[PDB]
Write an enzyme that holds these catalytic residues in place. Structure first.
Site, PDB file in Angstrom:
ATOM      1  CB  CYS A  95      -6.591  -1.626  -5.995  1.00 44.26           C
ATOM      2  SG  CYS A  95      -5.832  -1.253  -4.521  1.00 44.26           S
TER       3      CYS A  95
ATOM      4  CG  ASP B  90      -1.943   1.118   1.215  1.00 43.69           C
ATOM      5  OD1 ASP B  90      -1.965   1.631   0.155  1.00 43.69           O
ATOM      6  OD2 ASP B  90      -2.365   1.600   2.244  1.00 43.69           O
TER       7      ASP B  90
END
EC number: 3.1.3.48
Lengths: 156, 149, 149, 156
Positions: A101, A69
């Site tokens: 995502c 991330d």
């Protein structure tokens, strides 16, 4: 104004679709959106709890390539990706590769951006064209990475 | 009076949703997992809102809109869950950027079914990817209030 | 746009409730003698009105106001009559003269709880005594519509 | 703006209260309003279906003096009325006489107007003062009658 909805990107033979995540329930509806936009290939790049096959039983090639991330894509991942695009667009031109995502505006768009750059779009234009369709685009690191990126330039 | 209102309409083009919005903590909202018993229904009707945000499983994750109309033949006990209802209607949900000028939101609101958008700003601090942070809600009222004061 | 709205606020002082009102036949209204079963309740919620005039035994004889809030713990079947409910709350009912200028009604509406007055003109034809003839309803919306167009 | 509510008129020792009609249900509440405004005497002048005694058991002197819808008061009625006022205001000064009727702005206000005129208020002022408190006042005939009226002038 907008919903939490997919976002398609084109040029030249290339067509992408940056998406949200489904739970397993939505998943029949999710695969329906996908088929609509003519996607062959989904690339997961955050983790998702839905269990894919139904998307594969519908004949969409799913790829689990999660990365960190906030990060830029690991080297392989980028290699695989470019290499993936060549084969998949060669398989049938003007189809769509989906990237999905949780956010929608972090790492998924980077792959797409990468694509356009490695396919001869000015780094500046690339970021702007993406930010046009989804605003918020990338983070400093995502952007650093994007400017510092150098096309081979590799995309037949 | 008439002169204030004139200033108000003119100030639409300068002020933004952020100025006028209603923070999350201060909004009537519903948990997706709620059950429509007599109390909660009453709660709903007593809210004097006709369009209520439904979240799960924390107020910034807004998953659905509940319209009053949606309650039409629900019988308290049977004790129907709120998500079965929301799953009967895909009511769309409108998001607006915190930046947007009120004059624009006025137009949107006229040009749609909606009298309430959920407010969002992009958020850059953090290592992670950018995200949209829900700030709370702006309604058509909120904008009118701008004008009729 | 901003210029129309400016004209609109300025025209408040010239136009009147009559211009903006909603005739009786076109208003959602309720018969005092109605019974709050599943259908009529649904009817209510589907009205998307939060304050509904109650008449007896013909629409111009308006005897009471029903607020949505008033429905809070009523259970369809039991099959409660509408007048038992109205008789739980003396909600006031606002009358406005057909003559009244909108700018004035704006103020009234701000200066009260109400977002809807019932419209009246005195009526002189006939041998009988003057009377007030109900024309229908003006709402706060009706007045805003004046401005945001 | 207003409800369907009573309307009080004064000057000099005289106090009137023009009212709506009750059904027998409201009637306890109706009598409560009456006692509040200090009324001793109600004059019905349209017909009403409520059955008075409860108002009389509360010690308000009720008088049924109906006349024609739209008309001016018959001669007696006016005589009785003026005569009624003398005795009732003599009985206790600054109390209230209620007049009630379905409209509120036809014949009931006339009695009141009559009172003020026969008590030395300019006919013009009389109509205006009444119309101030309830608008719509009277009809042509009611007004004709009022101008053409000539105080004795009789009200001790």
């Amino acid at each position: 104004m907008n919903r939490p909805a997919p976002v398609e990107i084109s040029y030249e033979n290339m067509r992408f679709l940056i998406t949200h995540n489904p739970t397993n329930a939505t998943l029949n509806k999710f695969t329906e959106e996908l088929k609509k936009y003519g996607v062959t290939t989904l690339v997961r790049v955050c983790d998702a709890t839905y269990d894919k096959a139904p998307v594969e039983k519908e004949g969409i090639h799913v790829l689990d390539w999660p990365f960190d991330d906030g990060a830029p894509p690991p080297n392989q991942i980028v290699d695989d990706w470019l290499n993936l695009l060549k084969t998949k667009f060669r398989e049938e031109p003007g189809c769509c590769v989906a990237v999905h995502c949780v956010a929608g505006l972090g790492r998924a768009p980077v792959l797409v951006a990468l694509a356009l750059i490695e396919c001869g779009m000015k780094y500046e234009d690339a970021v702007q064209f993406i930010r046009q369709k989804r605003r918020g685009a990338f983070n400093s690191k995502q952007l650093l990475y994007l400017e510092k990126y150098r096309p081979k330039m590799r995309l037949r | 009076g008439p002169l204030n209102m004139i200033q108000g309409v003119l100030e639409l083009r300068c002020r933004t949703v952020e100025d006028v919005l209603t923070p999350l903590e201060d909004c009537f909202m519903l948990d997706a997992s709620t059950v429509l018993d007599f109390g909660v229904l009453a709660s709903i009707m007593q809210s004097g809102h006709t369009r209520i945000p439904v979240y799960e499983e924390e107020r910034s994750n807004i998953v659905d809109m509940l319209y009053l109309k949606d309650l039409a033949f629900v019988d308290p006990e049977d004790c129907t869950p709120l998500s079965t209802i929301t799953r009967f209607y895909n009511h769309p949900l409108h998001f607006v950027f915190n930046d947007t000028k009120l004059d624009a939101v006025l137009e949107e609101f006229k040009r749609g079914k909606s009298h309430l958008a959920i407010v969002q700003k992009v958020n850059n601090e953090g290592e992670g990817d950018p995200f949209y942070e829900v700030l709370g809600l702006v309604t058509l009222e909120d904008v009118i209030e701008e004008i009729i004061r």
